[PDB]
Amino acid sequence: IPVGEVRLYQIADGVWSHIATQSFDGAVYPSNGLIVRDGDELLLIDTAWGAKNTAALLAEIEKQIGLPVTRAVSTHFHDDRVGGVDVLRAAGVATYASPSTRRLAEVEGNEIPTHSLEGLSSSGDAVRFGPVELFYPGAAHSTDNLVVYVPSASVLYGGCAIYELSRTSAGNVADADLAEWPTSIERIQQHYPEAQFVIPGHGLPGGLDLLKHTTNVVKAHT
Numbered sequence: 001i002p003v004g005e006v007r008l009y010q011i012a013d014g015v016w017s018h019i020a021t022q023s024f025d026g027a028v029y030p031s032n033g034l035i036v037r038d039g040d041e042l043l044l045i046d047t048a049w050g051a052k053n054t055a056a057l058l059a060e061i062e063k064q065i066g067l068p069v070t071r072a073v074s075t076h077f078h079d080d081r082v083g084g085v086d087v088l089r090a091a092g093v094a095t096y097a098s099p100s101t102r103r104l105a106e107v108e109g110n111e112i113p114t115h116s117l118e119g120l121s122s123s124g125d126a127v128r129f130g131p132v133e134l135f136y137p138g139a140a141h142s143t144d145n146l147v148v149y150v151p152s153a154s155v156l157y158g159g160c161a162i163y164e165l166s167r168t169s170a171g172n173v174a175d176a177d178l179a180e181w182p183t184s185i186e187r188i189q190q191h192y193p194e195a196q197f198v199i200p201g202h203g204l205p206g207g208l209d210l211l212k213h214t215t216n217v218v219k220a221h222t
């Protein structure tokens with residue numbers, strides 16, 4: 001599946017994942033994001049795939065957590081990551097993304113996070129943003145895709161550069177760099193070898209095997 005469902009669940013102390021459903025290419029798909037406790041506030045990673053879903057997520061957070069989202073980071077320019085930024089900004093959330101994400105979202109006519117995150121322009125770059133580490137592994141699902149690690153919980157949020165284990169063929173590669181994607185995954189594996197919980201952009205989370213599985217699928221496409 002049903003469209004417009006929004007919910008969340010706890011992965012660890014102060015770490016949640018939010019799950020929303022929306023339509024892509026005329027079929028209903030799930031989509032994941034992250035919520036991380038940031039003192040008496042919350043950091044949001046990615047929208048819930050649209051204004052309506054994202055407003056519903058803000059209310060779901062009050063039902064289940066009860067702390068204010070004060071900042072949000074979008075991990076690439078696609079509408080399942082930035083659609084809802086306008087709702088967030090009007091609610092008083094400060095929205096962030098890399099300059100590449102902001103530029104590519106503008107070209108697409110998508111909603112545009114307000115603030116630019118410098119320090120993520122070269123593959124392997126990392127910065128801390130409140131309670132998470134932001135990492136640019138290089139081009140993969142998109143040229144701008146970021147991954148997010150929670151150092152205090154060993155949670156790795158792969159975003160849409162990482163596939164769930166049930167997927168056996170590549171999905172949307174319109175914006176991808178298939179030649180670089182395996183190298184970019186290799187950087188993630190090398191940088192976050194202690195990750196205990198790995199979240200794809202779409203579908204079921206798992207362990208570190210989601211990384212090698214994604215490489216397998218991408219190479220088998222090529």
Ligand SMILES: O=C(O)c1cccc2c1C(=O)N(c1ccccc1)C2
Nearest residue numbers: 024029078079080160170171172202
């Ligand atoms: O990576 C994918 O193929 C994928 C799988 C499930 C759901 C989605 C995707 C994908 O690429 N999406 C998307 C949504 C809006 C704009 C561009 C891509 C949605």
Ligand SMILES: [Mg+2]
Nearest residue numbers: 025172173174
């Ligand atoms: Mg097409």
Ligand SMILES: [Zn+2]
Nearest residue numbers: 076078141160
């Ligand atoms: Zn995407």
Ligand SMILES: [Zn+2]
Nearest residue numbers: 078080160201
């Ligand atoms: Zn996605």
